[PDB]
C-alpha cells in the first residue's frame, strides 16, 4: 500500500525528466575545450571504432569532436547521477598511474569506490569466490582510462559486460568503445582533461546523493501529517 | 542468472530478454535508468577489421585558408624568436599578427599574392614588429 | 550567439601554431624526479627534460621554461605492428628559464 507510493514518488519520478539533476550546467563545449578534451592521439594510433567521434586530423593529430563529446558526456553524467540517486555502487577504474592518487581521492570524497591498481583475474566474474557468496558487485563502473598499461582494453571492460554492469568510459582516439555502455570521446592523457572528468563525475554523484536525501526527507514529513 | 555472453547483443538486450523469460526474477538497479535514458549507440561487441584494397578511413585533414599564409610566413621569416604561450587562450604570435594584417589588406580589394605579402611586412615594421628574414 | 567548436578550434593557439617542429614554446615544470623535469607546454602530452648542468637548482616545481618543440607525441610503427607504439610524451629540447 505504502511501497507503491514510495517507489512512484522517489524512484520513478526522476525517470520522467530529461535532466532531473541539471548536469548540463556542469560543463560546456568551451569548458571542455579549455581542458584540452578535444586533443587525441596521432593518426597512426587511431582505433577504427573511434572514427565516428573524430572531428579530423590536424597535422597528423586527431581532433575529437566536442559537439559529440558534449552529447555523450551529457548522457554519461545523467546516467551516473541517476545511479547515485538510486544508491548504486559506483566503481572508478583506471590504470593510468599519473592519476591513481587523484582518482582514489575523488572516489573517497564522493563516497564511492576506486580500483586503480593491478586488476587481478576474476575480480568481477569470480567475485563470490574472492570476496564471499553475499558480496554485492558494483552497479556502475566508470572508466577514466579504458586501456591498461600495455595499450590494450582494460580487462574489466569485457568483464563488466559479462556481469551485465553498465560502464561509463572516457574513450580516446586509440580506445575501443564497442562494449562501453556510455562512452564519452575525450582526451584521457592531459591532467586538465582528467581533472575535469573527476570534477564532473564527483559533482554529479555528490548532487544526486544530496537530492535523494532531500526527496526522502520531504516524503517523510508529508507522510506523518 | 545473468548471461555472460558479452559478445551476443548488449547488457540491455540480454537483460531485457532474460527478464521476459522469467530467468531474472528482478530487474537490475540500472535497467530502468538505461531504458529511460539509453545511450546513443547500443553497446554491442564488434570485431575490428583492418582495411584492405582501396578502403580508406573517412577522417579528413583540418586545413584553413590562413594556413597558406602561415606556411609562407614561416618560410620567409621563420618561427618568431618570441615564444608561444599555449596556456593563454587569446595568445597571438607574430605569425597570427601577420595573418590578421594580411587578411585586412585582402579585404581592401588587393588580390595579388606576391604584392599582398610584401605590403603586409611593411605595415608591421611601421608598427615596430621585428621581422628578420631567414635568408 | 554561442561559439561553436569549429570556431574554438580555428582560433586556438595550438591550431594557429601549425607544425610543432622547431617551435619555441613556454612550458611549466609540474613534476620532478631526481634530475628529470616533467614540463607541460599546453599540448596533449608533457615532455621530460634533464636538469641543465648550469643553474640546475633554479629549475623547481612551477618554474616556467623555454622549450624548442620537436614532436607533440613520440610515436612510431615497428615491423609487424598493427598500430603505432606511443610513449605518451612529447619530444622537446629545454633551452633555459623564462624571466620577466
Amino acid at each position: 500500500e505504502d511501497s507503491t507510493d514510495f517507489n512512484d514518488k522517489i524512484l520513478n519520478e526522476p525517470l520522467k525528466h530529461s535532466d532531473f539533476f541539471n548536469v548540463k550546467e556542469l560543463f560546456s563545449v568551451r569548458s571542455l575545450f579549455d581542458a584540452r578534451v578535444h586533443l587525441g592521439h596521432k593518426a597512426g594510433c587511431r582505433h577504427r571504432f573511434m572514427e565516428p567521434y573524430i572531428f579530423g586530423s590536424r597535422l597528423d593529430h586527431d581532433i575529437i569532436d566536442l559537439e559529440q563529446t558534449a552529447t555523450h558526456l551529457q548522457l554519461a553524467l545523467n546516467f551516473t547521477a541517476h545511479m547515485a540517486y538510486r544508491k548504486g555502487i559506483i566503481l572508478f577504474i583506471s590504470r593510468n598511474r599519473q592519476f591513481s592518487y587523484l582518482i582514489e581521492n575523488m572516489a573517497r570524497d564522493c563516497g564511492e569506490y576506486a580500483h586503480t591498481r593491478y586488476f587481478r583475474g576474476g575480480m568481477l566474474t569470480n567475485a563470490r569466490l574472492l570476496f564471499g557468496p553475499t558480496v554485492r558487485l558494483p552497479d556502475l563502473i566508470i572508466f577514466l582510462h579504458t586501456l591498461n598499461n600495455i595499450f590494450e582494453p582494460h580487462v574489466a571492460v569485457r568483464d563488466a559486460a559479462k556481469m551485465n554492469i553498465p560502464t561509463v568510459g572516457i574513450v580516446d582516439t586509440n580506445c575501443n568503445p564497442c562494449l562501453i555502455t556510455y562512452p564519452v570521446p575525450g582526451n584521457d592523457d592531459s591532467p586538465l582533461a582528467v581533472h575535469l572528468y573527476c570534477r564532473l563525475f564527483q559533482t554529479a554523484i555528490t548532487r544526486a546523493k544530496e537530492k535523494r536525501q532531500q526527496v526522502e526527507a520531504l516524503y517523510r514529513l508529508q507522510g506523518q501529517k | 542468472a545473468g548471461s555472460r555472453l558479452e559478445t551476443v547483443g548488449s547488457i540491455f538486450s540480454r537483460t531485457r530478454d532474460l527478464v521476459r523469460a522469467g530467468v531474472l526474477k528482478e530487474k537490475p538497479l540500472w535497467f530502468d535508468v538505461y531504458d529511460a535514458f539509453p545511450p546513443l549507440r547500443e553497446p554491442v561487441f564488434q570485431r575490428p577489421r583492418v582495411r584492405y584494397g582501396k578502403a580508406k578511413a573517412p577522417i579528413q585533414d583540418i586545413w584553413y585558408h590562413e594556413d597558406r599564409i602561415r606556411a609562407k610566413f614561416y618560410s620567409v621569416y621563420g618561427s618568431g624568436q618570441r615564444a608561444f604561450d599555449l596556456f593563454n587562450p587569446n595568445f597571438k604570435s607574430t605569425c597570427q599578427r601577420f595573418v590578421e594584417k594580411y587578411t585586412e589588406l585582402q579585404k581592401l580589394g588587393e588580390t595579388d599574392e606576391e604584392k599582398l605579402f610584401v605590403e603586409t611586412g611593411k605595415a608591421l615594421l611601421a608598427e615596430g614588429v621585428i621581422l628578420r628574414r631567414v635568408g | 550567439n554561442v561559439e561553436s567548436f569549429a570556431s574554438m578550434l580555428r582560433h586556438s593557439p595550438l591550431t594557429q601554431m601549425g607544425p610543432a617542429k622547431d617551435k619555441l614554446v613556454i612550458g611549466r615544470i609540474f613534476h620532478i624526479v631526481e634530475n628529470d623535469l616533467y614540463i607541460d607546454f599546453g599540448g596533449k602530452f608533457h615532455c621530460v627534460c634533464r636538469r641543465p648542468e648550469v643553474d640546475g637548482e633554479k629549475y623547481q616545481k612551477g618554474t616556467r621554461v623555454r622549450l624548442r618543440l620537436l614532436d607533440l607525441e613520440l610515436t612510431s610503427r615497428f615491423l609487424g605492428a598493427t598500430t603505432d607504439t606511443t610513449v605518451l610524451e612529447a619530444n622537446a629540447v629545454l633551452l633555459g628559464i623564462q624571466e620577466s
Binding site: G56 | Q60, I62, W63, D67, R68 | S4
Partner: peptide, 26 residues
C-alpha cells in the same frame, strides 16, 4: 553555412622532397 569549418586542400606546410647530391646533374 559556417565560415569556421575546415576547407579541403593540400598540405600547405608540406616540405619539398629531399634530393640526392647528384639530382639534376649529369
Amino acid at each position: 553555412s559556417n565560415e569556421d569549418l575546415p576547407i579541403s586542400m593540400e598540405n600547405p606546410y608540406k616540405e619539398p622532397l629531399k634530393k640526392c647530391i647528384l639530382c639534376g646533374k649529369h
